[PDB]
From Swiss-Prot:
Gene3D superfamilies: YppE-like
Record's protein name: Uncharacterized protein YppE
InterPro entries: YppE-like, YppE-like_sf
Gene that this polypeptide is encoded by: yppE
Lineage: Bacteria, Bacillati, Bacillota, Bacilli, Bacillales
Stored Pfam families: DUF1798
Length: 123
């Protein structure tokens, strides 16, 4: 197992963010039928655990090294905002600009973390 765990976690979160953004982006053109219970019940748990675990690791990394490009508040914010991002993506409680703004802030932060993770380089 040669795995960059904390990096892969971040890469995964980047995909989920773009997936949620893409979901809302297209969601209007194609007939999109879904139910808020079956596939979304576990999906919440995954992201809930994911964000909690990621934050713990990221917070550790920036304590060992030092947040140069990433902002600590942003790490703490992305964790929480990401959960609401996934929520608003499917429930459509979001309007327009804030959805892409949060996604942009998440992508921004994740890109910064991704750099500093590889900037230390894992063994």
């Amino acid at each position: 197992m040669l795995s960059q765990t904390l990096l892969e976690m971040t890469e995964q979160m980047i995909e989920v963010a773009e997936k949620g953004a893409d979901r809302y982006q297209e969601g209007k053109n194609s007939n999109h039928s879904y139910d808020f219970f079956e596939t979304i019940k576990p999906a919440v748990e995954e992201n809930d655990e994911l964000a909690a675990r990621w934050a713990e690791g990221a917070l550790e990394l920036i304590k060992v090294r030092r947040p140069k490009y990433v902002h600590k508040e942003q790490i703490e914010a992305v964790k929480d905002n990401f959960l609401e991002l996934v929520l608003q993506s499917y429930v459509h409680h979001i309007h327009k600009k804030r959805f892409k703004d949060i996604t942009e802030s998440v992508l921004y932060t994740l890109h910064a973390v991704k750099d500093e993770i590889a900037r230390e380089d894992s063994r």
